[PDB]
Amino acid sequence: MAHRRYCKRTIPPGYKVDQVFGPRTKGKEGNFGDDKMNEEGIKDGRVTAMLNLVPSSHACLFGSRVTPKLQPDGLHLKFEFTTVVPRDDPQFDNYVKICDQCVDGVGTRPKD
Amino acid sequence: RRYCKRTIPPGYKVDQVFGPRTKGKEGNFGDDKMNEEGIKDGRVTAMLNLVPSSHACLFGSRVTPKLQPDGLHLKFEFTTVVPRDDPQFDNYVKICDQCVDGVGTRPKD
């Protein structure tokens, strides 16, 4: 909702991803989500799974590589945060399989 | 899956949670003052205004998975823009100038 900073927006019940965070892409901003995670938003249980891998505020600020870039329109501040899920993590397989599905997953749906 | 959910409680330095501050690498945010003071630094609080929420990081990011022998490396690249005419622009710019790759410096300048 529109009275929040874009970066602070959250996807409320019954909204599509695309929606709060724009259409799903490939190899750009907003590339996470297939056609079914887009439609179900927080309904999709793969979402709940995935948020376990999203940095907190603190982690995002202090655990990322942070790169400022000034441009005529202002300051673009990029946080690059990489979560490592160890190959022996009980949820490794699931996490890999979600990412599979949804990273650049526009135009596709799961179940195979 | 949990390092990434860490937060810095009161009395902790950044580097007692997120490792020593670096330059051009992971953990590059925070000068010696900010590292020392952790969440007590007034600049942190402002800077957290620019950090994506959970949902915005997942879905507003460019997300890139890489499998390596060690496991899955999930990278989120999220860019926040502060407009040149934002009342907070000059402030954000200065904090970034102090804190980005700021290890080994302190404010007052």
| Whole-number Cα distances in Å, A10 to B15, B48, B50, B78, B81 | 29, 16, 14, 15, 18
How far apart CA A86 and CA B73 sit, in angstroms, is: 9
**Phi–psi pair at B27, nearest 5 degrees:** 80, 25
Residues of B in contact with A33 (CB under 8 A): 59
| Whole-number Cα distances in Å, A50 to A37, A105, B97 | 11, 15, 33
Q: What is the DSSP letter of A10?
A: -
What residue type is A77 in one-letter code?
Answer: L
Q: A65 and chain B: CB distance < 8 Å anywhere?
A: yes
Q: Which residues pair with B82 in a beta bridge?
A: A75
Strands A65-71 and A74-86: antiparallel
What residue type is B18 in one-letter code?
Answer: F
What Å resolution does this PDB entry report? 2.2
Q: B92 and chain A: CB distance < 8 Å anywhere?
A: yes
Q: B31 and chain A: CB distance < 8 Å anywhere?
A: no
* Torsion A49-A86-B72-A58 (CA) sign: positive
Does an H or E element contain A100, and which? helix A92-102
- How was this structure determined? It was done by X-ray
Distance of CA A8 to the CA centre of its chain: 13
Residues of A in contact with B93 (CB under 8 A): 68, 70, 75
How far apart CA B67 and CA B79 sit, in angstroms, is: 24
Give the tokens for residue A1: 């909702």
> A95 vs B72: CB contact, 8 Å cut-off?
yes
Q: B46 and chain A: CB distance < 8 Å anywhere?
A: no
Of B24, B75, B92, the CB nearest to A82: B75
Residue with tokens 């249980």: A45
> A74 vs B83: CB contact, 8 Å cut-off?
yes
How far apart CA A9 and CA B8 sit, in angstroms, is: 23
> B100 vs A9: CB contact, 8 Å cut-off?
no
Of B14, B73, B84, the CB nearest to A73: B84
Torsion, Cα B83 B88 B92 B94, to 10 degrees, reads: 110
Residues of A in contact with B49 (CB under 8 A): 5, 8
> A29 vs B55: CB contact, 8 Å cut-off?
no
Contacting residues for A62 by C-beta, under 8 A, at least 6 apart = B8, B14, B17, B18, B27, B29, B30
What residue type is B95 in one-letter code?
Answer: I
Of A54, A49, A74, the C-alpha closest to A64 is A54
> A63 vs B100: CB contact, 8 Å cut-off?
no
Q: Which residues pair with B78 in a beta bridge?
A: A79
| Whole-number Cα distances in Å, B108 to B31, B37, B98, B100 | 12, 16, 10, 16
